Each structure stands twice: as structure tokens, then as C-alpha cells.
Coordinates of C-alpha atoms in Angstrom, one line a residue:
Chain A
X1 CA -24.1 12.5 0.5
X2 CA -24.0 16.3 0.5
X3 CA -22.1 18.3 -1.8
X4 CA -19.4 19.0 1.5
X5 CA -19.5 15.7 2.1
X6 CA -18.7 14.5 -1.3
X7 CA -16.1 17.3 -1.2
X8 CA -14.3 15.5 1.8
X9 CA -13.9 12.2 0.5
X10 CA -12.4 13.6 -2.8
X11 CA -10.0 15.6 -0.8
X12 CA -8.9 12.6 1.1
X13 CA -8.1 11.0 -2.4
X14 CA -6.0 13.5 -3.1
X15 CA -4.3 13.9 0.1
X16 CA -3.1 10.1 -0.2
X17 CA -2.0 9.7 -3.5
X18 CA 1.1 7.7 -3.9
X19 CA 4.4 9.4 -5.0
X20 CA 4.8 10.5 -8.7
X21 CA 1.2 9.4 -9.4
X22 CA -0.9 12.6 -8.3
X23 CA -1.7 13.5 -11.4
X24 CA -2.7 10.0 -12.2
X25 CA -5.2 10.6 -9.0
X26 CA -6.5 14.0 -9.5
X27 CA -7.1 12.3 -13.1
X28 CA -9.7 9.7 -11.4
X29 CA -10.6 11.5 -9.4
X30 CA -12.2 14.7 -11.2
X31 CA -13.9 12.2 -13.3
X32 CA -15.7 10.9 -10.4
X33 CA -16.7 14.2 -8.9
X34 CA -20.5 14.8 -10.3
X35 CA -19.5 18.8 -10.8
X36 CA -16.0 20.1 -11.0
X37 CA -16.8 22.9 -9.1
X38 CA -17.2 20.8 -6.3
X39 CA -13.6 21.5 -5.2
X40 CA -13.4 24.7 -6.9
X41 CA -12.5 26.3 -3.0
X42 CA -10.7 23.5 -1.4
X43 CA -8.1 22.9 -4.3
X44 CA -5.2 25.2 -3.9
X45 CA -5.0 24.6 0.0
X46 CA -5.0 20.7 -0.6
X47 CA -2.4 20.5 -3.8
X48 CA -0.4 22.3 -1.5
X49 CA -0.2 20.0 1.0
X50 CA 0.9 17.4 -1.0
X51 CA 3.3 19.6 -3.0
X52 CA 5.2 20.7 0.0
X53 CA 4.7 17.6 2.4
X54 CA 6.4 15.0 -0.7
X55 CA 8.8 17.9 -1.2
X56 CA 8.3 17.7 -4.9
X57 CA 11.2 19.3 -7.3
X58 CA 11.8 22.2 -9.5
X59 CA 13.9 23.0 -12.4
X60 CA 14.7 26.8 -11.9
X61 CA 17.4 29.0 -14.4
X62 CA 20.1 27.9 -11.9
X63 CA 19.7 24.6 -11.1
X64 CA 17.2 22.3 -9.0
X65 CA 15.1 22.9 -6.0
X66 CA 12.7 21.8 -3.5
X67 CA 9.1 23.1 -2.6
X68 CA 9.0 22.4 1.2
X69 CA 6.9 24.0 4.2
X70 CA 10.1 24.9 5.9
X71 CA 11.0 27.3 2.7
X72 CA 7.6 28.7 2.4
X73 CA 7.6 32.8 2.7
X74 CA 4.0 32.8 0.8
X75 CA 1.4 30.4 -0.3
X76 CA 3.1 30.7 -4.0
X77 CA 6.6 31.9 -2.7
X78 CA 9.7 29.6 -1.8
X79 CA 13.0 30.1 -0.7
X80 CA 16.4 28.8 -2.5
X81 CA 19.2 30.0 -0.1
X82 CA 21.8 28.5 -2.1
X83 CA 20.7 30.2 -5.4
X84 CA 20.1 33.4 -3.8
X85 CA 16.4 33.4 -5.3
X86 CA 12.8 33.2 -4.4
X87 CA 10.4 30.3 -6.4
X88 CA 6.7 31.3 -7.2
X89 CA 5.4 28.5 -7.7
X90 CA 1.2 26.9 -8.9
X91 CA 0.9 24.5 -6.9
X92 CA -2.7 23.5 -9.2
X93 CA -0.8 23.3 -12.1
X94 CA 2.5 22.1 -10.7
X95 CA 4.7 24.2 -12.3
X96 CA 7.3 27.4 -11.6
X97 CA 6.2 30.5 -12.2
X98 CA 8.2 33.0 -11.5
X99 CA 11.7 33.4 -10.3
X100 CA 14.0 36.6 -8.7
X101 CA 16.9 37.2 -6.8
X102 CA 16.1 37.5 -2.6
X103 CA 16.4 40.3 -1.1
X104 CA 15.9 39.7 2.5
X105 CA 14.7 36.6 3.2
X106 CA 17.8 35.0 4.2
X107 CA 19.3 35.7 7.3
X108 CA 22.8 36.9 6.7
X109 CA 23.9 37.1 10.2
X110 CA 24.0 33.1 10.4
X111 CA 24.4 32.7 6.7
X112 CA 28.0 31.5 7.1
X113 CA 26.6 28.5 9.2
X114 CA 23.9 27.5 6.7
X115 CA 26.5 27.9 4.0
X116 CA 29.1 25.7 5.5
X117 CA 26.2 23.0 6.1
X118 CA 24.8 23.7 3.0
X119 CA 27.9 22.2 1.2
X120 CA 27.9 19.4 3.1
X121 CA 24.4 18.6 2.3
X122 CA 25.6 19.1 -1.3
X123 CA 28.3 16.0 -1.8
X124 CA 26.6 13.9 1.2
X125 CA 23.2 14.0 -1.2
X126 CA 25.5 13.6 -4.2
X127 CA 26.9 10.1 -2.8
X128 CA 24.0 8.5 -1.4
X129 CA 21.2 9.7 -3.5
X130 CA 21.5 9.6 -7.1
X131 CA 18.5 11.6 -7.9
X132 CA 18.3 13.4 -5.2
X133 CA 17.6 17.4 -4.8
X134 CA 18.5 19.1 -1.5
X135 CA 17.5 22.3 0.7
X136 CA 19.5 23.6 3.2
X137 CA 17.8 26.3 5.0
X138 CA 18.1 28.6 8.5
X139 CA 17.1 30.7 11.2
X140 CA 17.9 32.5 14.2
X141 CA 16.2 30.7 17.6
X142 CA 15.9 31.0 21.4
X143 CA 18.9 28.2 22.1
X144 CA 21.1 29.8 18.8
X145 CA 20.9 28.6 15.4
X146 CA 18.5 26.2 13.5
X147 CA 19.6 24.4 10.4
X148 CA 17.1 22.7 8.6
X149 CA 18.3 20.1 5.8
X150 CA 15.6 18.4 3.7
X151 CA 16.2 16.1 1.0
X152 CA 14.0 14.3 -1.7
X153 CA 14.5 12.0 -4.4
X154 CA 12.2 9.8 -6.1
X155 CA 11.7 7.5 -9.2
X156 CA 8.6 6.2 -11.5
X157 CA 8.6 3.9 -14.5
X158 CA 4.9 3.2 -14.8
X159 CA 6.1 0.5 -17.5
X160 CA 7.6 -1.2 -14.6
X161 CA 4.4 -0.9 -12.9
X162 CA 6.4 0.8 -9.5
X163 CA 7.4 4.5 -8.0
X164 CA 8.8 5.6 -4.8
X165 CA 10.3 8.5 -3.3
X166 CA 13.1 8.9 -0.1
X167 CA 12.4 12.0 2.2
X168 CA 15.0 13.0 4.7
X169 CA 14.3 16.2 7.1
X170 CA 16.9 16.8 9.3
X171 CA 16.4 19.7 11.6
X172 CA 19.9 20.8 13.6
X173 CA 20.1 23.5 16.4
X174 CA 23.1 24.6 18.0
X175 CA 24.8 27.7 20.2
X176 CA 27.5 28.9 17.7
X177 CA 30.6 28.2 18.8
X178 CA 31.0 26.0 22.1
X179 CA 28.1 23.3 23.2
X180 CA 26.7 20.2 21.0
X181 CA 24.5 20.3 17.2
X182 CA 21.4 18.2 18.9
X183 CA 20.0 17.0 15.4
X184 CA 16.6 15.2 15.0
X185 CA 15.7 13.8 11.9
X186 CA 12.9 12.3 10.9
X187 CA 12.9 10.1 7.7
X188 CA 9.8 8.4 5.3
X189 CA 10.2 5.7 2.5
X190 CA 7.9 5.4 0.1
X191 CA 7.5 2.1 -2.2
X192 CA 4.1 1.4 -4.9
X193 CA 4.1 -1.7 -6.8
X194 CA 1.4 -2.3 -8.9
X195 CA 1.3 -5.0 -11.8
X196 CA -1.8 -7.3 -11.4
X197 CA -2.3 -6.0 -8.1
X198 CA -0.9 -2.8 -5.5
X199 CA 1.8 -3.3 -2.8
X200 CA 3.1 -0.4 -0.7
X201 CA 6.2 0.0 1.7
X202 CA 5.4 3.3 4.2
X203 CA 8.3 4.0 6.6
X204 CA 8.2 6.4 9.3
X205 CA 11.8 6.9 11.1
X206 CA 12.6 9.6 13.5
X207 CA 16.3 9.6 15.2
X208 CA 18.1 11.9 17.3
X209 CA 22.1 12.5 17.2
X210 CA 24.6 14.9 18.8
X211 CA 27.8 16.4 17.8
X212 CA 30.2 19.3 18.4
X213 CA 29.5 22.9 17.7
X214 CA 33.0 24.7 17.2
X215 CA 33.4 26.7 14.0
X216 CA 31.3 26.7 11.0
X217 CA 33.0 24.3 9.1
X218 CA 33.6 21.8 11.9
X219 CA 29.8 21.6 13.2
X220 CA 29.1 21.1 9.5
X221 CA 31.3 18.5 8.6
X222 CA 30.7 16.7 12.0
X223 CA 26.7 17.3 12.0
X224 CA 27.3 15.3 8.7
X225 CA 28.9 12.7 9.8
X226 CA 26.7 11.6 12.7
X227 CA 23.6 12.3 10.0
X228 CA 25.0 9.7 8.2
X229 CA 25.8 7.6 10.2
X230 CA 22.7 7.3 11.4
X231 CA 21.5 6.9 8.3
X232 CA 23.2 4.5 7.1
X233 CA 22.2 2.2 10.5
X234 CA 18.7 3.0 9.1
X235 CA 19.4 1.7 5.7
X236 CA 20.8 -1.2 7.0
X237 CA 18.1 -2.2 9.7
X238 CA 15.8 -1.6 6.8
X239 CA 17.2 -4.4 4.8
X240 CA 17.5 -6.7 7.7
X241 CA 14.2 -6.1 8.4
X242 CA 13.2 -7.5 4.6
X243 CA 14.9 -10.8 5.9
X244 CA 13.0 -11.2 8.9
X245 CA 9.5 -10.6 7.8
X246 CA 10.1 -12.8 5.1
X247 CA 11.4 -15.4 7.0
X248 CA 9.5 -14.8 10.3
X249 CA 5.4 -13.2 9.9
X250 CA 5.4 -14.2 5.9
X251 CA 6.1 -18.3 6.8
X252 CA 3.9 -18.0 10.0
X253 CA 0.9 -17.1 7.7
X254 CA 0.6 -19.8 4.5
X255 CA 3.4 -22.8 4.8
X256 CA 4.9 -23.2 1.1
X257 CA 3.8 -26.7 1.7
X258 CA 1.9 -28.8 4.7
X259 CA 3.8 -29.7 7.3
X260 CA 4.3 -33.5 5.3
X261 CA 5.5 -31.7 2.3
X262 CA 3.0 -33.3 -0.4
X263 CA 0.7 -31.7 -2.4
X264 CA -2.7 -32.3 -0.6
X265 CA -4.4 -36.0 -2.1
X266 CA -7.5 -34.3 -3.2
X267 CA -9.9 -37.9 -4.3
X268 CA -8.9 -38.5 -0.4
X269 CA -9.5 -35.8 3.0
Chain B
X1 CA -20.2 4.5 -16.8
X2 CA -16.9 2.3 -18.1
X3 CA -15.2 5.3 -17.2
X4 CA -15.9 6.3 -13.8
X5 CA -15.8 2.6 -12.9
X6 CA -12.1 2.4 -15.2
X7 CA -11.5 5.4 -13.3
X8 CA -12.1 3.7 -9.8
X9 CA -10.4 0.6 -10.3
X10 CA -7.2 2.8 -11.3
X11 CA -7.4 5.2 -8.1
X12 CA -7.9 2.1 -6.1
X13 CA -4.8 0.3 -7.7
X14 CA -3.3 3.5 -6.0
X15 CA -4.5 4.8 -3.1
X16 CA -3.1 3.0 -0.1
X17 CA -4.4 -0.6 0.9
X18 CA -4.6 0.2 4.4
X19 CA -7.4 2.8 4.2
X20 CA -9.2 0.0 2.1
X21 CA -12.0 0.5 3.4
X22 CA -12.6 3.8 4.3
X23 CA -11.9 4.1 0.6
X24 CA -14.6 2.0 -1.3
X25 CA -16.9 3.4 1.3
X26 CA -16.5 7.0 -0.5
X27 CA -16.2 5.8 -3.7
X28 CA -19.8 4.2 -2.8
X29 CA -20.9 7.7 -1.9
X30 CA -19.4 8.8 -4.8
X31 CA -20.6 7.0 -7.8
X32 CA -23.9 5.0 -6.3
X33 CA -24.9 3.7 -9.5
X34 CA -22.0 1.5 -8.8
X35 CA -22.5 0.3 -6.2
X36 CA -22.8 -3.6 -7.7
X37 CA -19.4 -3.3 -9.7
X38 CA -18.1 -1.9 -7.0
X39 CA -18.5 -4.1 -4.3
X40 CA -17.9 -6.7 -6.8
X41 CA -14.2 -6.0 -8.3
X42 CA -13.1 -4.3 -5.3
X43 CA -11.7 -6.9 -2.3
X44 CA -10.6 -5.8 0.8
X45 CA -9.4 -7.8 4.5
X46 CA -12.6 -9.6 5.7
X47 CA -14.3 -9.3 9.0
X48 CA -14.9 -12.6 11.4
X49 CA -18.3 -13.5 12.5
X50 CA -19.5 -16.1 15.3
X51 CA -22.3 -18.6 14.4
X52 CA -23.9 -19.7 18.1
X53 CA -25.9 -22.9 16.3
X54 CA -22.8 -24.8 15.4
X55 CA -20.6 -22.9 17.4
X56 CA -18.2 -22.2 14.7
X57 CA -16.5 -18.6 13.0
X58 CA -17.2 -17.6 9.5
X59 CA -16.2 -14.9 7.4
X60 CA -18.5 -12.1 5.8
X61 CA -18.4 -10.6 2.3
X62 CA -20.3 -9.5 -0.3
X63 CA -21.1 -12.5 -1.3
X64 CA -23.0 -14.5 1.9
X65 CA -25.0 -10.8 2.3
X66 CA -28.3 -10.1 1.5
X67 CA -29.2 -6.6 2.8
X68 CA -27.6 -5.9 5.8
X69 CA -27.5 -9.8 7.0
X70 CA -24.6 -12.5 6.5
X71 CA -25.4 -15.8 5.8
X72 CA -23.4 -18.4 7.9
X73 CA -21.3 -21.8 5.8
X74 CA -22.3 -24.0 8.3
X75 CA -25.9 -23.1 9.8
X76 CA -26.9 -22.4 6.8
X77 CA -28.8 -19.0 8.7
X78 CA -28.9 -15.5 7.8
X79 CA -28.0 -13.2 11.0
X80 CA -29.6 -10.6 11.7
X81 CA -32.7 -12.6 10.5
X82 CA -34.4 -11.3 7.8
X83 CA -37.5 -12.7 5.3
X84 CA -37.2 -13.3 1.6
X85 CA -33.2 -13.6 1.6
X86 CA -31.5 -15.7 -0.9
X87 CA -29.7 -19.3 -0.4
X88 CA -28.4 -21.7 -2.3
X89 CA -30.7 -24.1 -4.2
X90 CA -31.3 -27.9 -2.4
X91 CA -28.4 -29.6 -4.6
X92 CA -26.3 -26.6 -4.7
X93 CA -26.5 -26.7 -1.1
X94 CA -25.4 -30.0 -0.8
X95 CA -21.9 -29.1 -2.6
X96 CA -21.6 -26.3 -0.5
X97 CA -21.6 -28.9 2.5
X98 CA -18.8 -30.3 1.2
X99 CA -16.5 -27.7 0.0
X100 CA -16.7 -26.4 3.2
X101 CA -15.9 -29.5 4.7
X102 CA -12.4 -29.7 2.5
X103 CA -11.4 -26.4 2.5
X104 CA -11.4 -26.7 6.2
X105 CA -9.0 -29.5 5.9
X106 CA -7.3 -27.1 3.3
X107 CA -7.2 -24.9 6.4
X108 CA -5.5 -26.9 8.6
X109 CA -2.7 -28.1 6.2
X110 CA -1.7 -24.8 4.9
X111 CA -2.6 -22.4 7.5
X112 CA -2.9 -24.4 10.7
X113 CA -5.1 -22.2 12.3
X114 CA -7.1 -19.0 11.0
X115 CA -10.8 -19.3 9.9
X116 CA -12.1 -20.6 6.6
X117 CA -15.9 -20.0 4.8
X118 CA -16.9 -21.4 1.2
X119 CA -20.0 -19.7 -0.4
X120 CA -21.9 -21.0 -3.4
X121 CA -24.7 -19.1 -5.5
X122 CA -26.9 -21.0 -8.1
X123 CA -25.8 -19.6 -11.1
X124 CA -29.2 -20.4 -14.0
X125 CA -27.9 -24.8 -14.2
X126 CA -24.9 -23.9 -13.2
X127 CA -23.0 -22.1 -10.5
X128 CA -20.3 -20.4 -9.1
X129 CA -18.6 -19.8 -5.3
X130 CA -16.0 -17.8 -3.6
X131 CA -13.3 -20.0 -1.8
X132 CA -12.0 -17.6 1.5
X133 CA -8.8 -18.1 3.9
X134 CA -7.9 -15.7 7.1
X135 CA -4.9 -15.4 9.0
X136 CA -3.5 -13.6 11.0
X137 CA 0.3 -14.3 12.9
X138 CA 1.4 -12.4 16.2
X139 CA 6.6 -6.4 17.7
X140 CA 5.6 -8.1 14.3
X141 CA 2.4 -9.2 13.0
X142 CA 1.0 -9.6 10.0
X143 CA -2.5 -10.7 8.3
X144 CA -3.4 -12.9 5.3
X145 CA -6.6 -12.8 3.1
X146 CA -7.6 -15.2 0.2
X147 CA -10.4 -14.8 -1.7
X148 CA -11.1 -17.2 -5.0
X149 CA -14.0 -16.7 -6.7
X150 CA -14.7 -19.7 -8.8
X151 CA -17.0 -19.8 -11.7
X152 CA -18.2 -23.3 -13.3
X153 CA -20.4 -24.3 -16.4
X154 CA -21.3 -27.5 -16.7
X155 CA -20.3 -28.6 -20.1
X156 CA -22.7 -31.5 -21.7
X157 CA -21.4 -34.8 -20.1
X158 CA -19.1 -35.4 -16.9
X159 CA -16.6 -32.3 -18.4
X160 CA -17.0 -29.3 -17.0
X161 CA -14.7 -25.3 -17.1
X162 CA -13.4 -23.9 -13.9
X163 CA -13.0 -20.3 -14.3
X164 CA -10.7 -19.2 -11.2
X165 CA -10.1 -15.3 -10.2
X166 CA -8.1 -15.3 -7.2
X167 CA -6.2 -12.5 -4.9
X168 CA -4.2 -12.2 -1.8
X169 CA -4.5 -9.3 0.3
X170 CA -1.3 -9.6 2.9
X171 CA 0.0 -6.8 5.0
X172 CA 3.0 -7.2 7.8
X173 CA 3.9 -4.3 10.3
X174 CA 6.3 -3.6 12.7
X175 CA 7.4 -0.7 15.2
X176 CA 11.2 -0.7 16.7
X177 CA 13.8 1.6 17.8
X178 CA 16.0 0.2 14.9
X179 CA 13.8 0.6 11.8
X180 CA 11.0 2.4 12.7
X181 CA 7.9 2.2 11.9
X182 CA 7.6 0.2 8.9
X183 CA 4.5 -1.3 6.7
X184 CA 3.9 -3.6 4.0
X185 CA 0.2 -3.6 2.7
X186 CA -1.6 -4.7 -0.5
X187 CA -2.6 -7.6 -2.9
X188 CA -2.4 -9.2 -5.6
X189 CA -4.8 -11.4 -8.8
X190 CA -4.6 -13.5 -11.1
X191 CA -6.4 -15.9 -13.4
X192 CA -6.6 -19.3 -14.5
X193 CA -9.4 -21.3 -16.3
X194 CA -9.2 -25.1 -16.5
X195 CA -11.6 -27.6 -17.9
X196 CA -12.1 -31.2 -15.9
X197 CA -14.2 -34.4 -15.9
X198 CA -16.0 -34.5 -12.4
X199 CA -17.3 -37.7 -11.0
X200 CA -18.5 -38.6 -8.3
X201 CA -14.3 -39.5 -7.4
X202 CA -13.1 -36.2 -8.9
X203 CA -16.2 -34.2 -7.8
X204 CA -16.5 -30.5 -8.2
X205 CA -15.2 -30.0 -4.8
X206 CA -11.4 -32.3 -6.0
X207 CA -11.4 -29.8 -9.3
X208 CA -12.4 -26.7 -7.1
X209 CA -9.4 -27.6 -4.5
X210 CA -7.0 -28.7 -7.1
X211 CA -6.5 -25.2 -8.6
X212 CA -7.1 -23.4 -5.4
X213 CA -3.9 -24.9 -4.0
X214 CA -1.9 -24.5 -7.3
X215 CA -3.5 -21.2 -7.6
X216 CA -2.7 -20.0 -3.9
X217 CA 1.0 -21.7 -4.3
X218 CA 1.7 -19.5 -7.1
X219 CA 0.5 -16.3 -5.7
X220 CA 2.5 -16.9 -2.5
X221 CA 5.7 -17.0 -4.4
X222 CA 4.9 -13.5 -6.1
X223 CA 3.8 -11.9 -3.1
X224 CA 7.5 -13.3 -1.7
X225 CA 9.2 -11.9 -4.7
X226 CA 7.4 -8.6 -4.8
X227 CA 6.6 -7.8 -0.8
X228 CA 10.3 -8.7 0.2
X229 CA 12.4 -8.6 -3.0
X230 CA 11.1 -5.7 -5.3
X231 CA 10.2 -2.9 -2.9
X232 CA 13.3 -3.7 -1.1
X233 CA 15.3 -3.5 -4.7
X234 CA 13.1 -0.2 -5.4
X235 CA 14.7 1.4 -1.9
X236 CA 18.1 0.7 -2.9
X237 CA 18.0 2.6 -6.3
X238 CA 16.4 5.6 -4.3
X239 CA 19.8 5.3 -1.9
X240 CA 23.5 3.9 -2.5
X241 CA 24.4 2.4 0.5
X242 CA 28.1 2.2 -0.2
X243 CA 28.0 5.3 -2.4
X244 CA 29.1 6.5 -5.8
X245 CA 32.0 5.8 -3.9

């Protein structure tokens, strides 16, 4: 009931949203707030959070790109290895603001490994996600090399009363050269449906797979296809699982019919 | 305020079902004056109760509360006790009886098993009651919520208009090594109003049942369609399986 308090539970609002519809939320829920100053402290911190954690997209001068944590140099300030260039983006108002070349940022010594993953990120988001945007960025770690491949895509026809997003963050580290790529990848599916009601699929997948680290291309091309792969055993347990609920949990709930298979004899019981 | 309470129906059409509560508990905090509309248009998975005098469950909502205390289908008794709470009037009581007797029966045949709880309030001459189912199946498990609110107004001689607003809250979850973690979580209303002679054969209780079980029949096929068929259909358009390719 205090002004913090009422400050909290507008924040968690926020924070939950469903994909594509934030604005839709901060809409509702600035009207509810009794003073818009209320979050006049808490607001750039908390639009950031959901920003970076849906792994919204950008249109840039050269192309699309992703605001993510994992390319965050500043608050405002996000990196596009493969366009050279560092995003400013407002996270309040949910635009780009600025744009330049980098000049620093990436690490060139390692650079030809993020590249050759990087292309591979490129087609393999090309051919399984039609409007999907990818990242590929990278680093220099205790046990060699760390890859980091995010990639986003979502869709919204409020006419159709639905939205949803795919988010895929595949994190790869590797000695350059001789050992395995030990890639862990965690992946969330999102799904709102909401004529005459609101229905939501959340997914929360994390998998683990290993491949050979020989030269750049190679440990690219074969980080990719174990990715894939596992994947695509993902995809396919996910639709299974569609069966099985339906046909397991969904029938042991409300028969269709009683177990005689009349329509109850209401004058009679 | 139509708009802060058009404004909270929206964000609640949106913000995810399983923090239900939680959620209408801010809102409450929120926007106070409220606090009727609220807990009025806003449904969520009820909570089971025990009634030690006939030894029986019931469920609790907004509508069997009168201050902090639930009033129980069968005893008829508010717990905790309280003075000056409300019941239903002597011949409204009566009907109560007996649409908590059916939709028992209801129980059994659809559900075989879960917990069932028929409210009435006297409504002027006429009246109105909600109509409430819970289930809940046993890694998968999943939960099922009915609530029908049922409005009727007597109308002259032996014909009388059921007004029916029903939804389904239904959520399913499960937690493997091949999928994940996965949830499905929501609900979903709709209307129907239907006018009918009631005698003492087709008493209110026969019209009340009637289009509860059409009513519930229908929703079940949508939440099929939608909970297993549309989000699934939604996923594939985010990702091409096979691949433009």
C-alpha cells in the first residue's frame, strides 16, 4: 500500500509481459499507477530487462540485429560483430539511437573463430527460422574460446488474437585447435492465445552437446551440426508431447462423454 | 473508472495465468475502488475446503464469502464463524439443496472424482448461482476449474431466462529430459442465454444442468483445439522443421 510497494507490483507487470505485447502492458499499466512518477527511478533498469532477456530486434543501416545481455558493452551500448558496429539503443522508448563503426570491442585475436561460426549461424537461422534474427558473439576464456550464438524470432497478429517468440542461446567453448566444442544451450518457447479467453505455452529447455575442435571452419560447421540436431530432437519431442497431453492429462480431467456415452437424463438422477 | 477496470481486464488477458493470483492481489492494491469488479470478472483455480459437520469438501470463492468466512454447500455454515453474514433465503435454500445434489451426480459422470460446490444468492424475486467443478489428474499432471455463473429471472408464468457465463481454467505440466520443462496454463468464456418452462419435472435445477453440460461440452472442445492444436500450429510457424529446404 505504500508508494514502494505499489511500485513493486507495477514492476512485476512489466517484467512478465508476454512477447510482442509490452507495450500493450506498459499501456495498462501506467494507467493504473495513481502518479506516473511512481516509476520514474525504476523504469530504465526494468525495460531493460525485458529488452535484452526477449532478445528483442533492431533494424540498423546495415541490416538486423539483436539487443541481448551477452552484447551489452553499456546500459545503452550493444555489440554487432558481424556489422562491425556498436547499437545505442533507449530501451524506454524502444528504439535505436545511435549507430558507429567498433573500434575495439571485438576481439580480433579469436575473430576468425567467431567468424567462421558466425556464418554458420547465418544459413542454419535462415533454414529453420523464417523470421529469425541472429548474434554470434565471442571471447577469450580460462579453457580457450567462448562462442556465444543467440537467436530470436517472433510473430504477432493481434487480429488473430495470438503472439509468440522462439529464443535459442547457445553458448560453445572450446581449446582452438585439438580437444571437443562442449556446447550448452538453453532454449524458451513462448505461445499467447487470447480470443474469449488467455492460453500460454512456456518452455524451458537446456541441452548439452559435444563436437570436434580442429580448424575454424570444421568446429563451426560441426558445432552446427550437433546444435541442430539437437534441436531438431527438441522440436520433435515438443510435438509428441502435444499428443500425449492431449490424449493422456486432457482425457483424465473431463470425459467428452460419461462412461455410458449418453447425454446425462436430466428429469431423472 | 471504465478505464482502469478496461485497462485491468486487458493486462490480465495478458499477463501469465499461472501468477493468477499473485496478480489480482496487486491489482487489488492497485485500484481498491475496484475491488467488487474485480473480484467479480476476474476467475482464477479455486482452493478446497473441508466441512467437519457433514464430513464433506467444498470449494471457496468469491461468491460463498462474506468477509473473511466461506460458507459451506452442504452445512449450510459459515467458517470461521462470524455474526450478521448472508445466506440464501428459506426457498432459495431449498433449490440450492438440490443443485448440489445433481451437480454431484454431474460430478461423478463427467469427472469421476474431484470436488463439486453450487452456490445460490437471492437475487430481489429472483436469483442467480455459480455452478463449480475441480479436478485435478496425476511426470504429468494437470488441473481443471469450471466456474458457471448462472443468472435467472423468472418470467410471469412457468417460463423463465437462463443467463449462463461460463469459463474453464486448465493448465497441464510436465518436466523430462526430452522436452523440458514445458507448461500449458489459462482459460477460456463464453456465453449463452436460454429461456425454458420449469416445472416441478423440468425444475430450475433440469434447465440449470441442461446448459451446464452443453455449455461445458463445448468449451472442452475449444480448449482441445486451442491448448493442443493452435499453440502447437503457432510453434511451427516460429520454426520449419524440415526447412526452407
Amino acid at each position: 500500500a505504500s508508494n514502494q510497494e505499489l511500485v513493486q507490483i507495477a514492476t512485476n507487470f512489466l517484467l512478465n509481459a508476454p512477447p510482442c505485447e509490452f507495450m500493450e502492458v506498459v499501456s495498462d499499466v501506467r494507467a493504473l499507477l495513481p502518479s506516473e512518477s511512481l516509476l520514474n527511478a525504476s523504469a530504465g533498469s526494468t525495460f531493460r530487462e525485458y529488452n535484452t532477456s526477449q532478445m528483442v530486434s533492431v533494424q540498423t543501416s546495415k541490416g538486423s540485429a539483436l539487443i541481448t545481455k551477452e552484447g551489452e558493452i553499456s546500459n545503452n551500448e550493444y555489440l554487432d560483430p558481424k556489422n562491425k558496429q556498436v547499437i545505442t539503443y533507449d530501451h524506454i522508448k524502444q528504439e535505436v539511437t545511435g549507430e558507429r563503426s567498433a573500434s575495439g570491442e571485438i576481439e580480433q585475436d579469436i575473430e576468425q573463430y567467431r567468424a567462421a561460426f558466425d556464418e554458420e549461424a547465418t544459413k542454419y537461422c535462415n533454414e529453420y527460422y523464417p523470421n529469425g534474427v541472429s548474434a554470434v558473439y565471442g571471447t577469450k576464456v580460462s579453457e580457450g574460446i567462448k562462442i556465444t550464438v543467440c537467436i530470436s524470432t517472433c510473430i504477432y497478429k493481434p487480429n488473430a488474437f495470438y503472439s509468440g517468440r522462439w529464443r535459442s542461446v547457445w553458448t560453445c567453448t572450446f581449446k582452438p585447435g585439438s580437444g571437443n566444442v562442449t556446447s550448452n544451450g538453453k532454449v524458451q518457447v513462448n505461445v499467447h492465445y487470447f480470443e474469449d479467453g488467455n492460453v500460454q505455452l512456456n518452455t524451458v529447455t537446456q541441452k548439452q552437446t559435444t563436437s570436434p575442435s580442429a580448424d575454424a571452419q570444421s568446429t563451426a560447421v560441426n558445432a552446427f551440426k550437433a546444435i541442430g540436431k539437437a534441436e531438431l530432437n527438441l522440436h520433435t519431442a515438443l510435438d509428441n508431447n502435444y499428443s500425449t497431453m492431449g490424449d493422456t492429462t486432457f482425457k483424465a480431467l473431463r470425459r467428452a462423454l460419461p462412461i455410458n456415452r449418453t447425454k446425462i437424463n436430466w428429469q431423472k438422477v | 473508472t471504465e478505464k482502469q477496470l478496461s485497462c485491468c481486464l486487458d493486462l490480465m488477458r495478458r499477463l501469465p495465468p499461472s501468477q493468477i493470483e499473485d496478480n489480482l492481489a496487486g491489482l487489488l492494491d492497485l485500484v481498491p475502488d475496484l475491488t467488487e469488479d474485480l473480484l467479480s470478472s476476474i476467475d482464477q483455480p479455486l482452493k478446497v475446503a473441508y466441512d467437519a459437520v457433514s464430513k464433506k469438501d467444498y470449494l471457496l470463492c468469491d461468491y460463498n464469502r462474506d468477509a473473511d468466512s466461506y460458507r459451506s454447500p452442504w452445512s449450510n455454515k459459515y467458517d470461521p464463524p462470524l455474526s450478521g453474514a448472508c445466506y440464501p433465503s428459506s426457498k432459495l435454500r431449498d433449490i440450492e439443496v438440490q443443485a448440489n445434489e445433481i451437480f454431484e451426480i454431474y460430478l461423478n459422470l463427467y469427472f469421476e472424482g474431484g470436488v463439486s460446490s453450487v452456490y445460490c444468492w437471492d437475487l430481489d424475486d429472483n436469483f442467480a448461482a455459480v455452478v463449480l467443478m475441480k479436478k485435478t489428474q496425476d511426470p504429468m499432471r494437470g488441473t481443471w476449474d469450471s466456474i458457471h455463473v448462472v443468472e435467472v429471472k423468472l418470467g410471469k408464468k412457468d417460463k423463465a431466462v437462463y443467463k449462463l457465463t461460463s469459463t474453464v481454467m486448465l493448465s497441464i505440466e510436465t518436466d523430462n529430459d526430452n522436452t523440458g520443462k514445458v507448461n500449458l496454463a489459462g482459460s477460456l468464456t463464453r456465453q449463452d442465454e436460454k429461456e425454458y418452462t420449469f416445472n416441478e419435472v423440468d425444475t430450475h435445477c433440469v434447465n440449470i444442468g441442461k446448459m451446464v453440460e452443453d455449455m461445458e461440452s463445448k468449451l472442452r472442445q475449444t480448449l482441445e483445439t486451442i491448448y493442443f492444436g493452435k499453440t502447437k500450429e503457432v510453434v511451427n510457424t516460429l520454426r520449419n522443421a524440415t526447412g526452407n529446404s
